[PDB]
Design a protein around this ligand. Structure first.
Ligand code: HEC
Ligand code: HEC
Ligand code: HEC
Ligand code: HEC
Length: 108
């Protein structure tokens, strides 16, 4: 069938700063804006699959840079932090919760 959203509490732990991803709080976002087209087909593999966002150099800005794909603005698909910046706006509490580098819902 079509793929279904997994349960909440999925740990992204390619790095030393792992982050929990909950589908239940992202239902306002289409599946394909994250599980984005690759060669025109939505791809539901893990983001850091080899040949995907598998460069663990957090300084890399190419599409393969994992850090880059999770944190930067101006990306072809919204990143976690990019979309959250737009969502938080001028609301300082939401900026901390959604975009803070520490003491946020991504990074404790
Ligand atoms: C403020 C601008 C932030 C700073 C600085 C960093 N983060 Fe994040 N972050 C997010 C994800 C999805 C990951 C990957 C989790 C995993 O698979 O382990 C990370 C990872 C990091 C790391 C580790 C990089 C390395 O390779 O060691 C650093 C240094 C880091 N981040 C700093 C997600 C999020 C997120 C959710 C929306 C927010 C608000 C932030 N990150 C914020 C920052
Ligand atoms: C971005 C905000 C997303 C939206 C919208 C949806 N998903 Fe998602 N999903 C996302 C992440 C960051 C993760 C973890 C990937 C990681 O690399 O571990 C996932 C994972 C899943 C999975 C499991 C994939 C795997 O481990 O094999 C699937 C099947 C899944 N997601 C499905 C899916 C559906 C069908 C969506 C729409 C209803 C959907 N996702 C939305 C990020 C995001
Ligand atoms: C491999 C099959 C992939 C998987 C699984 C995911 N991504 Fe991806 N991503 C991939 C390619 C080949 C590219 C470039 C496509 C092209 O048109 O240039 C991207 C692009 C991104 C971007 C934009 C990066 C930029 O503009 O520099 C982001 C933000 C991104 N991808 C995020 C993302 C996430 C969150 C994923 C897991 C849910 C994910 N991608 C999977 C290849 C692959
Ligand atoms: C927009 C296109 C989004 C993308 C890409 C990602 N997120 Fe998100 N997120 C978004 C919304 C609209 C909301 C709700 C905001 C509110 O005020 O609560 C969120 C929420 C979060 C949260 C907090 C809720 C929770 O699940 O505990 C976290 C921790 C979260 N989002 C993480 C996250 C990650 C790790 C992403 C990239 C893989 C990601 N978000 C993408 C919208 C959007």
């Amino acid at each position: 069938a079509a793929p279904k959203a997994p349960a909440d509490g999925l740990k992204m732990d390619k790095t030393k700063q792992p982050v929990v991803f909950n589908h239940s709080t992202h239902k306002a976002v289409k599946c394909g804006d994250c599980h984005h087209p690759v060669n025109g087909k939505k791809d539901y593999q893990k983001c850091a699959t080899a040949g995907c966002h598998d460069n663990m150099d957090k300084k890399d800005k190419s599409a393969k840079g994992y850090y880059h794909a999770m944190h930067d603005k101006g990306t072809k698909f919204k990143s976690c932090v990019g979309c959250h910046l737009e969502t938080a706006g001028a609301d300082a509490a939401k900026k901390k919760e959604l975009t803070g580098c520490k003491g946020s819902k991504c990074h404790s």
